[PDB]
UniProtKB/Swiss-Prot annotation:
Subunit structure: Monomeric.
Binding-site residues for O2, renumbered to this chain: H64
Record's protein name: Myoglobin
Pfam families, A to Z: Globin (PF00042)
PROSITE patterns registered for this protein in UniProt: GLOBIN
Length: 151
């Protein structure tokens, strides 16, 4: 569980992401694709992009990153009480996009990577631990929803 204090560490650094949602989204997606090229291959809409220059030039990829971080921001602001936000996400990702649960672990690592790179002053050991726990709770609730939907 996170304490209220730990939720504040999470929402404090998230307010730094919210200063530049689009730029953070691009850095996280590019990090994910570089770390785990199987993830890009699974994105029919984006799999054409072959290089980092092409990825940073894609307005579609940029708008997608904004959707992702907007949805995740709304989830984190619920401080674990995200059942309602998770339902449509689990539904689309299990049954429509067919995203393997492991990919949610990979994007969590990519989020930690970018937060650390851009906000080290707001991402000390306690803030890193709090964000890891918040994303782990998210991933595990999605995993349980995946299984409930038969995926
Ligand atoms: C924090 C984790 C995630 C959040 C909050 C998130 C959120 C979203 C949202 C809000 C959309 C548009 C609405 C919808 O279809 O549900 C979406 C679409 C999609 N997402 Fe995720 N998502 C994440 C994890 C992933 C991962 C790990 C991948 C890697 C393949 C992924 C790829 C998919 C794809 C392929 C679409 C459709 C994009 C398109 O072609 O328009 N997402 N996501």
């Amino acid at each position: 569980v996170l304490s209220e204090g730990e939720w504040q560490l999470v929402l404090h650094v998230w307010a730094k992401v919210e200063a530049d949602v689009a730029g953070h989204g691009q850095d996280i997606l590019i990090r994910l694709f570089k770390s785990h090229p199987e993830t890009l291959e699974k994105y029919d809409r984006f799999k054409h992009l072959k290089t980092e220059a092409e990825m940073k030039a894609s307005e579609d990829l940029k708008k997608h990153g904004v959707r992702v971080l907007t949805a995740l921001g709304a989830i984190l602001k619920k401080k674990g009480h995200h059942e309602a936000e998770l339902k449509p996400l689990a539904q689309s990702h299990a049954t429509k996009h067919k995203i393997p649960i492991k990919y949610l672990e990979f994007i969590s690592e990519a989020i930690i990577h970018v937060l650390h790179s851009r906000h080290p002053g707001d991402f000390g050991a306690d803030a890193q631990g709090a964000m890891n726990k918040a994303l782990e709770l998210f991933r595990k609730d999605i995993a349980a929803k995946y299984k409930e939907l038969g995926y």
